[PDB]
Every structure is written in structure tokens, then in C-alpha cells.
Symmetry: C2
């Protein structure tokens, strides 16, 4: 009687690890949530066919409010798996669910999978140079989130890159595009005047990481803000000072303006 937290990866059903698949295939009950991220290259049906089990999808409320009443009860007398997009413990609050598991006397194990947090390495930007991360949240009513702007400022001041997770409204089927994120950032800039994000700021966009042909683009906000980066999910990155090799990759692979090759050391 145990509970497995198993990541499904970045884009499609084949992004699950072999370990995760073999373990999922032998579980008695399989649950999953698809509100923390978007797997744009698969369907519930394909995932179900791969693991050979029926998958009960849980809503954010089911998990946050009733994980211990829906999943844990079964884990006390059966092998249960809880599937999630990407890595189950990255940019989610699922780690806390392991405490609930302990309290219920249920042992839990974690099976990792490709995460967008590390996949950004495909942009050519050195992973160790990424600083604090942030999420660009949709404004709601009179509330306009701006914390992410300060994160960029803090990292950039230290010469570090900033990974910006983009908002998602699973129920409404709304996925924030890199374009919308840029528009919001420009609005915060006009409000704060920190000189952190402007039309001349160099940015990198990574869309549908995990697919064989993800969209990887780098350039100035003024040029990319109205560019079509394809279907979601998208992630936006605001690089700090570039090493020469980072600039070379952005130019050669992400189509960045050749002028960025001339770094100001």
C-alpha cells in the first residue's frame, strides 16, 4: 500500500520516464491532475492507452481540499499513482501532499520527469546563470500582480537570467502567451519606470518544449511582441548579461539579431 507521485513530462505521453511507466502499469489505481501545466502533444486517451489503466482526473479543488479523502484512502490498501505534467514537485504545491500522505500512514515515492525548469537549457543560456524564478499572473479585477517585475530587476542586477512561468487557467482553457506576458511587463515598466523591461530588452521565448520541434526565439521585445510563437504552452526568459557562447547559440539557433554577438563586457 503506497502512493507514487509520477511526472508525465513536458509535451506528450512519451515524456514519462521508463521507470514511471513500468511502475504506473502495475498500480491498482491511477489518478492525475492536469491543471498545473499543459501537455500540448497528447490526450488523456493516449496516456491511458500507454499505461493501460483508467485515469481518474482530479480538479484543483479535489486535490487541494480532498486529496486525503479521494486518493489516500485507497493508498492504504492498494498501490496508487498520482500523475502530473512535467515534474510533480516543480512549480507546484504538490510537495505538501507528501506530508498528508505521511499523516495518513501512507509511504510515498517520487518519480521525476523532464521539467520546463531544466528544459530551458535548450535556449542555449547557461542553466547555472538562472536566478530566482517568477510567474506572470493574469490581472484580476482591480488587482494587478507585479512581483515578477521585481524578480527580473533583482536577477538582471546580478547578471542572472530570469525564467518566467506564464499563467494558466485550466478550467477556462486559458494559457498565457509570451506575447501577453510581454504586454503586461511593458505596462508594469510604465508604472514603475525601473528601466527593467522595455522595447529594447532582449528576451527569449520557448514554446512547446518537449516536442521535437519546439519554437525557440530570441530578439528585442519591440520585434517579438507581435510574433506568432505557435500553440501554448509558452515560457518567457529575460536574459542577464550574456557570455559569448550564449549569444552565439541565440543567433545560430534561436534566430537572434547578429548584433547581440557583440557583448558589452
Amino acid at each position: 500500500m503506497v502512493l507514487y507521485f509520477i511526472g508525465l513530462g513536458l509535451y506528450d505521453e512519451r515524456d514519462i520516464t521508463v521507470k514511471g511507466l513500468e511502475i504506473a502499469k502495475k498500480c491498482d489505481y491511477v489518478f492525475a491532475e492536469f491543471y498545473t501545466s499543459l501537455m500540448a502533444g497528447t490526450t488523456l486517451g493516449r496516456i491511458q492507452k500507454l499505461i493501460g489503466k483508467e485515469i481518474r482526473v482530479l480538479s484543483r479543488e479535489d486535490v487541494e481540499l480532498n486529496f486525503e479523502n479521494i486518493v489516500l484512502p485507497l493508498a492504504k490498501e492498494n498501490d496508487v499513482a498520482f500523475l502530473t505534467p512535467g515534474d510533480p514537485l516543480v512549480a507546484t504545491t504538490h510537495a505538501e501532499l507528501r506530508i498528508r500522505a505521511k499523516r495518513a500512514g501512507v509511504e510515498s515515492y517520487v518519480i521525476h520527469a523532464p521539467s520546463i525548469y531544466s528544459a530551458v537549457g535548450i535556449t542555449g543560456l547557461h542553466i547555472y546563470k538562472f536566478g530566482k524564478s517568477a510567474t506572470v499572473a493574469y490581472p484580476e479585477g482591480n488587482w494587478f500582480p507585479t512581483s515578477y517585475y521585481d524578480v527580473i530587476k533583482e536577477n538582471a542586477e546580478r547578471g542572472l537570467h530570469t525564467l518566467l512561468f506564464l499563467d494558466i487557467k485550466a478550467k477556462k482553457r486559458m494559457y498565457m502567451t509570451a506575447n501577453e506576458a510581454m504586454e503586461l511587463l511593458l505596462k508594469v515598466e510604465d508604472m514603475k519606470k525601473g528601466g527593467v523591461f522595455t522595447d529594447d530588452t532582449l528576451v527569449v521565448v520557448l514554446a512547446r518544449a518537449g516536442s521535437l520541434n519546439p519554437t525557440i526565439r530570441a530578439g528585442y521585445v519591440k520585434d517579438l511582441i507581435r510574433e506568432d510563437f505557435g500553440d501554448p504552452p509558452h515560457i518567457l526568459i529575460v536574459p542577464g548579461k550574456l557570455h559569448i557562447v550564449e549569444a552565439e547559440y541565440l543567433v545560430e539557433i534561436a534566430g537572434a539579431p547578429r548584433e547581440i554577438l557583440r557583448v558589452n563586457v
Copy 2:
């Protein structure tokens, strides 16, 4: 005409993704490098058996000096796979290899897999709170590198966690232990006296991430410096101020002392 960069994941031969395995199986030639890191929970033989292909292992020199003479020629007229521990392109030197492919008229695609960079999510520490990362290198002769100490200092003063990759002598398969890293840091502290790493510093050790039975331990240096965390690899994290939820996970899951709930939050 195609080169696939395929990640092998965290620990053993089943940490490769289903996508990576199926693609590797269909490749005409398969190369691999084990110098950026190692796969401690498996062997080349077990990886070969899973993929059902002979694996040509390449040294750091083979890759950095002769990638275009060893791998690319075959990729020109065949489907070739290049396996790497973890997630491809996390290691800083990997990215440039895609430019080499482009220069040789070879298409390249990246197949992601779990990376320790994202797997640390299992420590319960929020991924967004991780700042710049660093590597603790073994001092040698008259060379005593200490830049990693400064990374911790700069992250911590901003309330961010610091991921410290530990040194490895790839060919000899000798891993720096978290204990050795702590000893080194106390030594650097005694030299810099910045009050960044002392007996009272709270640290988190993650050993054998990817395994079903990783060791996750949190506590003060004075208590953990001589503790046995099991077989390698080891990762050391120096967290910044903790969110109560992070602290509760460290206490409940990582055996941290209750004291952290009042001292480090």
C-alpha cells in the same frame, strides 16, 4: 541526416524517457558521454541491454576536440543518438554541439529527461526560490577555488536557496561527498569570515535523486557533517530563509530538527 541529443536522466537505466528509449532503439549509431556526470545506479552494459544497441563512449576530448569527426560524419547519412546523463544541454558545454551540427549540415533534436536541477524539488524547497547555482570543486595543489562561497552569500542575502553540484572525477568515478563539501565550506568560511557557512548553518543533502530510495536530510552543519548519507551522488543545498511550508516538509520528510521552524523561517 539527424542527430538526437538524448538525456538518460538521474540515476539508472530506466530514467531515460520512453520517447528517448524508442528513438535510441531506431538509431543506426549510438554514442554517449559520461564526463559531464555519471549514472551511479546502472552500468554501460545495462544501458546497452535496454537500448539493444552497442554504445560508443566518448571522452571529454573526443567531444570537445573531435565531435565533428567522430559523431557528425555518421549523422550525415544515418540517424545517430548522443546520450548524456541527466537532461541534455544543462551541462554548459552541450549547447555549442548543436551549432557544430548546424555547421555540418546535420539536423539535431533534443529529447529531455530529468535533471538534478529540477529534481531538487523533492527536498520540499520551492523551485522558484533557487538562485544562481555553483559547483564545489576539490582543491588541488596550490589551487583552492572559492567562488561557490560567494554564490551562496549573494543568494542567501536575497533569501534564495543555493544548489551546489559536487565535484566528480569522471574517469576514476570518485564522487565528492556532502560531508567533504561541508568540510571545504567551513574551511573557506575560516578564510573569508563572511559568516556565510558555519556550524549553525542549515543545509539540505539529497543523495541518489532518481532512485526510489534517495536520502533526503536536513539539519545544521555541526550535526550533519559526519553523518552517513549513503552512496553517491550527493548534492548539497544551502537554503535561504524558509517559507513555513518548506520548513514543515523538511521536518516531516527530511528529518530536520523542530528548531528550524523557529530559527530558519
